[PDB]
Design a protein around this nucleic acid. Sequence first.
DNA 1: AGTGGGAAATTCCTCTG
DNA 2: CAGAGGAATTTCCCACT
Lengths: 312, 275
Amino acid sequence: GPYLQILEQPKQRGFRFRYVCEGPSHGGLPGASSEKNKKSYPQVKICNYVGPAKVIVQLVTNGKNIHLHAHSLVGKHCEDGVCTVTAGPKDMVVGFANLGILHVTKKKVFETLEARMTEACIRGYNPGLLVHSDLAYLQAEGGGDRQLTDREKEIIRQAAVQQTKEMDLSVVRLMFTAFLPDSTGSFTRRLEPVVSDAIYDSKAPNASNLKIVRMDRTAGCVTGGEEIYLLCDKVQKDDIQIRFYEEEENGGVWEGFGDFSPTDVHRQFAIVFKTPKYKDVNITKPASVFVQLRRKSDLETSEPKPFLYYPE
Amino acid sequence: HAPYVEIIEQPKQRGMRFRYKCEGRSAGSIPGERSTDTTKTHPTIKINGYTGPGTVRISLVTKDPPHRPHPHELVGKDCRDGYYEADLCPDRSIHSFQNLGIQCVKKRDLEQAISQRIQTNNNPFHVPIEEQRGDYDLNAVRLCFQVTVRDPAGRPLLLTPVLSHPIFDNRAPNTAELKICRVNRNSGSCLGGDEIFLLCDKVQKEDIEVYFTGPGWEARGSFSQADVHRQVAIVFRTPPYADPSLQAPVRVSMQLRRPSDRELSEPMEFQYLPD
DNA sequence: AGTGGGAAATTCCTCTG
DNA sequence: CAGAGGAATTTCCCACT
């Protein structure tokens, strides 16, 4: 049976979204495999292929109930938010390069969202969950420029309304949908859509790069309780923590956390904490360990820095 | 002799930040220089040489001459079209103003900003029209009091307008208040060399320094532009003190200094110790 | 120039006093 | 509650290779 498969997932972190005002030409979404000199990109493949097929990709939310997202895919092959390609040769592996995620504004979410829900019902592009549950009508037989009625538009609004409030402009997900040639003519045989990994906006405070630029001190007494200044990249005081840890030999791990309050975080760019007590406060020689920043929310961490604990 | 306006409580020069219209009505008043954390003063004037009735108008003018109407606006009690105009309380000759707010304009809507000033005929110093077209420093403004009393004959005699000290917008690092928030150490030896991590408010690597002082002694911290972490933190090295054999703790002053303005922050306090 | 990244500008929100 | 301060959003701008 025919089915769509994701060859290479979207990167996921390190790609910044861009507002209309910023213009284009700032960068394209890279594949999860992106490398040094080599660059990768999102990649799909139609299995048990069907000659020539039509493939669209849209942006959807990351919530339990997958919905249409307000941002929009831009770049070549895109129009009105949805990207469109078509693999018709004997080649069934299409790749999406030079893709850009346009960051709509909070005060433009509703307008954009609604107009995005209808265009979907018209083109009949997955209004299954994406908009209205019983609006499953026309699974693709939506008809070229075939108008809608008021038995759904009034239903749409009630959706584009409640959804506009639960949208997280900080994260999106790519949804691939394939269509096959049916009863000659064109593409209307939908192949059951697939959703990609979530993609996180790097310019968002809750997903920026975690990093430790500098430390006034890199050693401390096993007793703990010693003050240290840590200079870092933007972080959120109520969602950041310093984790000291040591890997054992039995596959075990010991951990300690710098002690501090939000008021101990200087303009998101620096933290003043007190060191934690080391594992055993009875060592004789210095014990090397690691320190790292960690975001409570994503449990996302930073590169580690060596820390030396020494005797009393 | 003609009666005159006298400023007895200048507006504080730094700290307050100009607020945009959108930030709401409850933005706040501009405080007097002599104010503090405990005491909360406000711009105040004395019309010495007259106690009868009258009217007072306050508006914003550029920092440097010619003192032409500023695009920003004064908002608050009795303000309209960007200016304040009300009657002088006839009881006392000393008047204070605790509801003055500065409302900056979106860099965009500036052209129309100079327009309203014109069309409303504010020009306290009647600067010719050709003069008020150029650029405007959107971070510096001065208060101007145009008071109006009455002559013996009972006719309205408007006094000479007075200008107060400049008021710098805090939302601009080079015009803002300097402040040392915290330091990871405040001791160091009298031979200097000790490293310090200093946390402060927004500064600029090209225009900042750490000024060490004490009677008969002045010196600077040593650090480089790269040592300025995200405009909010500086890591530098303490300088050598006067007495090399400074036995017995000696407490000096350490403060942030901005070359361009020659401005300094309140002292921090530091002690050079022997050895 | 197109990238990639930083800064500024403007808006919003939180807790204080 | 008013309104200081802190942040989050949106816009701009500047190195590069």
